[PDB]
Amino acid sequence: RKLRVCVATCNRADYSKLAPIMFGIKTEPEFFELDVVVLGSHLIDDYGNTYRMIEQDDFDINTRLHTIVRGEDEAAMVESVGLALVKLPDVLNRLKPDIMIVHGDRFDALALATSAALMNIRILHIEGGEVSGTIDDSIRHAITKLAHYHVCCTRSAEQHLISMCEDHDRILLAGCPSYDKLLSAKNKDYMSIIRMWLGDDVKSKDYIVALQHPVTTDIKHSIKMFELTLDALISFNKRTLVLFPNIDAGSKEMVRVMRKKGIEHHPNFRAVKHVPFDQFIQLVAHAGCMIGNSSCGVREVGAFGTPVINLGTRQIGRETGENVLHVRDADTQDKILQALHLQFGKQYPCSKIYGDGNAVPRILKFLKSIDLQEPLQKKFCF
Amino acid sequence: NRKLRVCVATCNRADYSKLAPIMFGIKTEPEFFELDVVVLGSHLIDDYGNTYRMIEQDDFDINTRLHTIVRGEDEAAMVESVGLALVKLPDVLNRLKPDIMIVHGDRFDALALATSAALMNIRILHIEGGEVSGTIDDSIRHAITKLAHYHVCCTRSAEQHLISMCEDHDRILLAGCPSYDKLLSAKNKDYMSIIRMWLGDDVKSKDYIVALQHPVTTDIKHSIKMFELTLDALISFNKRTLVLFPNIDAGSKEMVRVMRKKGIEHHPNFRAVKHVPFDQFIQLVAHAGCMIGNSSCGVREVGAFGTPVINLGTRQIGRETGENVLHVRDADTQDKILQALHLQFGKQYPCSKIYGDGNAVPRILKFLKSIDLQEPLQKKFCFP
Amino acid sequence: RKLRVCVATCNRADYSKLAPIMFGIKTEPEFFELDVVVLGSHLIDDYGNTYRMIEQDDFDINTRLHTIVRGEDEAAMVESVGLALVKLPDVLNRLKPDIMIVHGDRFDALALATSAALMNIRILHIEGGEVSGTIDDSIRHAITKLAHYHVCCTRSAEQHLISMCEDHDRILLAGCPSYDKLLSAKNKDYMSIIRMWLGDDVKSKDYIVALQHPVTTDIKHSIKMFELTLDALISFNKRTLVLFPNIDAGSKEMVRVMRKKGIEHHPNFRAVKHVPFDQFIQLVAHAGCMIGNSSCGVREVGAFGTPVINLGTRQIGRETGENVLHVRDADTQDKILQALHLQFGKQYPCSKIYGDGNAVPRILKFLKSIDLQEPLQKKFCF
Amino acid sequence: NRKLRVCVATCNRADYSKLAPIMFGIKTEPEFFELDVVVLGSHLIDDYGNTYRMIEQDDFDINTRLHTIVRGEDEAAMVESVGLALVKLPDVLNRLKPDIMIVHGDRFDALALATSAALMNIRILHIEGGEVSGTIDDSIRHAITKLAHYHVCCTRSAEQHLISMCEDHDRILLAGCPSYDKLLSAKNKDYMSIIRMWLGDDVKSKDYIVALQHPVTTDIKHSIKMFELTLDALISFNKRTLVLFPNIDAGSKEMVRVMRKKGIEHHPNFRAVKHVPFDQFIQLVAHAGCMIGNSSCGVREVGAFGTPVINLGTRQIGRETGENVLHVRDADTQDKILQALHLQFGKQYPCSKIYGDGNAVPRILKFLKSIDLQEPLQKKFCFP
Ligand SMILES: CC(=O)N[C@H]1[C@H]([C@H](O)[C@H](O)CO)O[C@](OP(=O)(O)OC[C@H]2O[C@@H](n3ccc(N)nc3=O)[C@H](O)[C@@H]2O)(C(=O)O)C[C@@H]1O
Ligand SMILES: CC(=O)N[C@H]1[C@H]([C@H](O)[C@H](O)CO)O[C@](OP(=O)(O)OC[C@H]2O[C@@H](n3ccc(N)nc3=O)[C@H](O)[C@@H]2O)(C(=O)O)C[C@@H]1O
Ligand SMILES: CC(=O)N[C@H]1[C@H]([C@H](O)[C@H](O)CO)O[C@](OP(=O)(O)OC[C@H]2O[C@@H](n3ccc(N)nc3=O)[C@H](O)[C@@H]2O)(C(=O)O)C[C@@H]1O
Ligand SMILES: CC(=O)N[C@H]1[C@H]([C@H](O)[C@H](O)CO)O[C@](OP(=O)(O)OC[C@H]2O[C@@H](n3ccc(N)nc3=O)[C@H](O)[C@@H]2O)(C(=O)O)C[C@@H]1O
Ligand SMILES: O=c1ccn([C@@H]2O[C@H](COP(=O)(O)OP(=O)(O)O)[C@@H](O)[C@H]2O)c(=O)[nH]1
Ligand SMILES: O=c1ccn([C@@H]2O[C@H](COP(=O)(O)OP(=O)(O)O)[C@@H](O)[C@H]2O)c(=O)[nH]1
Ligand SMILES: O=c1ccn([C@@H]2O[C@H](COP(=O)(O)OP(=O)(O)O)[C@@H](O)[C@H]2O)c(=O)[nH]1
Ligand SMILES: O=c1ccn([C@@H]2O[C@H](COP(=O)(O)OP(=O)(O)O)[C@@H](O)[C@H]2O)c(=O)[nH]1
């Protein structure tokens, strides 16, 4: 009897780490049935219609759900969780999954975990034990408590889950699946990918990738920091790919910052919503430096030794190699402009903290090991 | 003095018994607190006894009422109910502009409230945090703990569980359960005329049973079978029995059907009721011959009167209980349950105080005033 | 190319008139594909889990939706319409229907019509031109305006649609599909159906079928009328099948009326949620009389000449034969008890106002006639 | 005197231009009316210009704000938006306890409002009822008419349409459009400094174009193509052009993308804007060289100033228009549109008053006071 697996994807931020697993599951039809659910940001033009990435990977999408309430603020974030919760249960009764794969720390993943847990559907939670110093910590660890099975990416994440009283029998230390793609990365014509996304006259290691997200707890500070960050980038004046923000609450106010600085119509800048993951890896792997507060900066790019400037409070407490320079109180242009001079064009050693490149096969085994006779979470309090 | 704006949301009598004392406390100190009350969930539902009325009869001004329950009385409907609260609450919370929100317990409804507050940067005081009940409710309770910024637990073991789950000890208050404020202040009026109202004219103290059994959502077909056998035992044991309708939504109509097909609703020996007012209910359980089923009251509250208890099934496995509680986990035959009734009916145990000292509310009011309004962000104490 | 037809059913009240069409469509696989959606009351124990009727007719249910908000009042009725509207669009994008069949005048049908119309899906509205003197008139006629194609049951209903400025080219006068079953009704052992539902010692034409619904506009009056109606039935003291109410708003207060009169535990009464349509036809066809305010009383039972007492304001303005006695101001027990003496055990001639028994084949032709090149409603104002 | 409790819900600038005058009227007579304002829909959305601010700047106390729009900018999202209003409104309406609710127009949002009021037995005054625009909006408008208990129409032909649709003539008031209260009272201030603010420093009266084109939801790919050609014409015709973003949700982002890829947002000849305040907008269109697209303003309002209009496509087919409007239904090439621009740009027509006399509001206030509060149930005049 095949294991019926449902994977729900809501944003490129999970799709980069779930697609490898989906590919793994699909390559073994003898042990697994796969149903894919697309919801959230994927269906939204502002976010780059990233459901197309799923279509271009040739996955049959069973179900599409509009689950985002418009407003781009905290109220809307909450209403979005509620919208997924009214819409999902009937889809889950139809699909009748044995287990559901949930990734990460976003509001959307809490909806998925909640709906599965309350309907007695097993949950495999990916990227569980980590620390990022925002509201996301809260969400991540609340999902951990709902989830029946856990897949973490580091030893320190494993120990955190065990410290949080999770059953060690239900934890698998696999590595991040993104590393399956990073450490298997086809450097094709990487120059023609640099030329596509940054411009014709750009040379390897001579450009910046800028990706900064609002922190929902302090939008007014997120605005001010982003202004100063752009001012620095303008002064530093080397070719810069600016990704639009990808946390919803505060997002339009951050986009307005870019608009009023003329970033959208500037020779030095390229404003984009989403770069396909395989192309994005090549971009960050050959970047002069990366700046902002993406998880990519602190978790992924270490693999290529790309210099990183991590700004603000998001990612405080994450494990990072020598390549990452933190500037918490990025409260002036000078501080940020300095960090750019220090880091731009350096080369660090290649780290492997968040993965060994064989996460997926370990995960597939862990899924086959699951015997279908209980379920109820056990909480090791002593 | 800038007053602390406190919003208390109540969804079910199961939280209202433990929140009402706090609401009374807050309301008695207008100089330090502003109070807004939000009523949602089960309270607005006839099947559950229109228990919003209990709030009206306590004289609280209800600011807002929200229909948040999706009909269906199954797991899908439970989930859609959480979602319905989440689409409805944020605009109410932006209007009310609370500094802190009080959330109680382990039910699906409390997870909606915690979620909405946490994602909108509203502070959360979570009541009854560190306990263990061995159902899906453990999961929910502990997920709420993680969202919540401030914690009020009822026992030392609950406090240690929160600390073991990596919560900041600075944000934990060990107060006791607020229900004990009412239990240990329970001035037994004419308790006989309360027995007569609810059980019948000819019933004597310690000669009746209070039966309160809830479905476990994880295994409804087993909940059904157990309840059938439980009623069969109660019919054979044949002493006057107050049967409270179930009060977990998923599986509820199938449990009600069990009662209907056994003729419990029209039987001389039984009284089928949705809700007994808390003050009257305390008197009922305090003088009962025994209590049977899987209520939290059985394992947490009635110990205070030494009332014998039969706890059936998997719900409440792992809760702290005094000598008054007899567990029958595999209640898989009528004989086992009928035996437990013979053993326990009419006994008297010593009065325990595990879940409270009777001064929870004043400790809570102080803890609320102590909160300085400059951060917020939860701290997670990860000792390796 | 086959016509993709979606039929959504929400309540037994539409299912009695849609099932015949569904059967017709399913019997012609060469011209039609059928997808069935079940939602609303069908999934609710209080209403008799009537999705089972759909399962027992062997229809493959594609999708099930929980769309009812609990509360059994007007607010809940509205929230229920809204719940269907958030849940349906993604189902309709998946099913990709060419046309959707909507029946009747209930809040649920307005949700269906609204969602179809705003998504450019064609609508065939069944039972369009009629008059019943409650809020339902409003709803029925608002659905008419959304709907692209109309199937009415009488000539007077056809003229009403034309008077309301509908295009006569898009109206089909077919008859009510319920008449396909009424005028083809297998009287099997009808006595053993009487014995099942009323009791062992009951003789044909010596029992009452009581079916009274709350009027949402005046619940307090609905309560009082129902009390007096039951009091009359108790005094008249002939075996009575009492169907629980089947309009949601006010329903629990009406059920409470029955409970406090001891109707549920009385030798003379049988309280039931739903009698299967085929069995119900036999019951009403052989009844001594029928009482209350069902549409069955004024539209269907005329076919058997069964005496009818229509109480209150619901059904004022419906077309009725000689068999129906109206008592609008049923404001005392005596008036109702009198109406019972007058009507119980009489036999009227068999009328055919609402159908000829060939509605379905006419409808199937009308569906095949639809050429798939526009759509936009035309409003004949002159 | 028991005051009439009036709730006005506003969802979009498209209703707010015609409801604000009534809200002002009601607010100026506190002795006869209590007013509660509900803001929902587009008003709370940055893409639409945060137009709740227009309500704040008119000094109305907003009782309630509701996020009711589902994101997606397509037909599915439009429907889910209606549903979202329907789950959120009933608890607000039970709280506000209105005697009557004012609903305007033909948009998906107004159907939610009408539905919720009608099913809760709240009386409805529907504004702008009897008109014809040849899209799905006809369907919506006429479905709202059927729900609504009281009707306020703007023309004699609209009145006859309502009567032909079997509405009770006793419940129809022919008032005029309230927008005309503002148009015919439009004290032209420094209109040049308003032209300079919105179009640029060097622009002269009657030498600019106002372009406002909305997608038709029934045929988005055709809406796209038409808009491309329209912009190409405007680029060739090369006179200063205010381009308003689209204001029908379904298809909106694909229309915005058209503008983006033509470089309209960064062109000397164009100014891309979301919303111009109504009072300033009147001055813009009153002095425009011509107006182009498919706004209702083009066919209903600007006639008052004799401003030339080009109405493109199927939206507005069947509306009553003066000599100032040139229809180009099959705008299928750039040449056809460029021609229409040459023909119309800079002309001056006579001032028409088809949609109003400028005293709509006072007639409406009287009609509200006339309502006696003893029924309600709609009557449907079915003459055979
Ligand atoms: C600039 C560039 O190099 N390429 C084009 C990009 C690029 O292909 C994608 O971003 C890839 O993900 O696409 C285009 O542009 P794009 O689709 O980025 O849209 C840009 C506009 O979208 C608004 N925006 C952005 C993010 C967000 N969360 N909310 C928003 O409202 C901003 O106001 C901004 O002006 C296109 O397809 O139309 C056109 C652009 O020219
Ligand atoms: C039985 C009794 O002793 N007293 C009365 C009780 C009692 O006072 C209250 O329940 C107290 O909370 O009230 C009445 O009856 P009550 O309100 O209990 O309604 C009885 C019916 O409720 C249905 N039910 C209950 C719970 C649930 N989850 N779903 C349900 O469908 C059952 O079908 C059952 O028949 C009353 O108010 O009308 C009338 C009863 O006679
Ligand atoms: C009475 C009888 O002849 N037969 C049985 C009927 C019958 O089979 C069905 O109604 C058929 O549709 O079924 C049973 O009973 P039933 O399922 O009707 O449930 C009866 C109880 O449901 C509550 N109710 C009813 C309608 C409504 N809208 N809301 C409600 O809360 C009432 O309080 C009432 O007490 C059964 O299956 O359990 C048991 C009954 O014994
Ligand atoms: C252009 C101009 O003349 N003035 C400014 C305008 C203007 O004052 C207002 O629009 C008036 O309502 O405001 C600004 O710009 P504005 O708020 O128009 O934002 C421009 C961006 O909005 C996106 N958009 C618009 C509508 C829609 N449905 N979806 C969208 O994604 C487009 O991508 C577009 O690039 C501002 O407030 O920041 C800044 C602009 O510079
Ligand atoms: O244009 C992009 C930008 C990011 N990413 C990937 O998307 C994921 C999430 O990055 P993002 O900044 O969107 O969210 P965060 O991880 O910072 O929460 C990471 O795996 C990135 O490698 C991508 O594929 N294309
Ligand atoms: O008729 C009743 C039955 C119970 N309770 C109280 O309801 C609360 C919750 O009991 P329930 O069994 O409904 O929920 P649980 O706590 O078991 O989740 C406890 O404080 C009980 O003492 C009450 O006030 N009246
Ligand atoms: O037990 C019943 C009662 C009614 N009906 C049928 O259900 C439909 C609706 O009747 P109801 O009173 O439920 O609603 P109404 O038509 O009065 O709005 C009619 O076709 C009846 O013949 C049925 O099949 N079984
Ligand atoms: O910048 C603007 C553009 C339009 N309008 C007014 O908005 C209303 C609706 O116009 P729109 O084209 O947005 O909607 P429509 O009426 O076309 O549905 C009309 O009264 C316009 O005069 C406005 O006040 N400011």
Numbering used by the authors:
A (entry chain B), C (entry chain B): 8 to 389
B (entry chain A), D (entry chain A): 7 to 390
Which sentences from the paper describe this structure?
The crystal structure of the epimerase part of human GNE was determined at 2.7-Å resolution by single-wavelength anomalous diffraction (SAD) method using Se-Met enriched protein. Each asymmetric unit comprises four monomers (denoted A, B, C and D) in two homodimers. In addition, each dimer further forms a tetramer with a crystallographic dyad-related dimer, burying 1280 Å2 surface area on each monomer and showing the 222 point-group symmetry as observed in hemoglobin. Further away from the tetramer center, two pairs of CMP-Neu5Ac molecules intercalate between the dimers, burying an additional 390 Å2 surface area on each monomer. Only UDP was observed in the active site of each monomer despite the use of UDP-GlcNAc in crystallization. In fact, a ManNAc molecule was bound to a surface pocket formed by helices α1, α2 and α11 of monomer C. The pyrophosphate forms salt bridges to Arg19, Arg113 and Arg321. The allosteric inhibitor CMP-Neu5Ac is bound in an L-shaped conformation, forming an internal hydrogen bond between the CMP phosphate and the 8-OH of Neu5Ac. The carboxyl group of Neu5Ac, a characteristics of this negatively charged nine-carbon sugar, interacts with the three positively charged side chains of Arg263*, Arg266* and Lys267*. Therefore, at high CMP-Neu5Ac concentrations, the GNE tetramer assumes the closed, inactive, conformation to maintain the favored interactions with the inhibitor.
Sialic acid biosynthesis in mammals starts by converting UDP-GluNAc into UDP and ManNAc, followed by phosphorylation of ManNAc at the sixth position. Catalysis of both reactions is carried out by the bifunctional enzyme GNE, which in human is composed of ~720 amino acid residues and divided into the epimerase part (~400 aa) and the kinase part (~300 aa). Being a key enzyme that catalyzes the rate-limiting step of sialic acid biosynthesis, GNE plays an important role in regulation of cell-surface sialyation level by binding to the downstream product CMP-Neu5Ac. To understand the mechanism by which CMP-Neu5Ac inhibits GNE, and to find out the difference between non-hydrolyzing and hydrolyzing UDP-GlcNAc epimerase, we crystallized the epimerase part of human GNE and determined its structure in the presence of substrate and inhibitor.
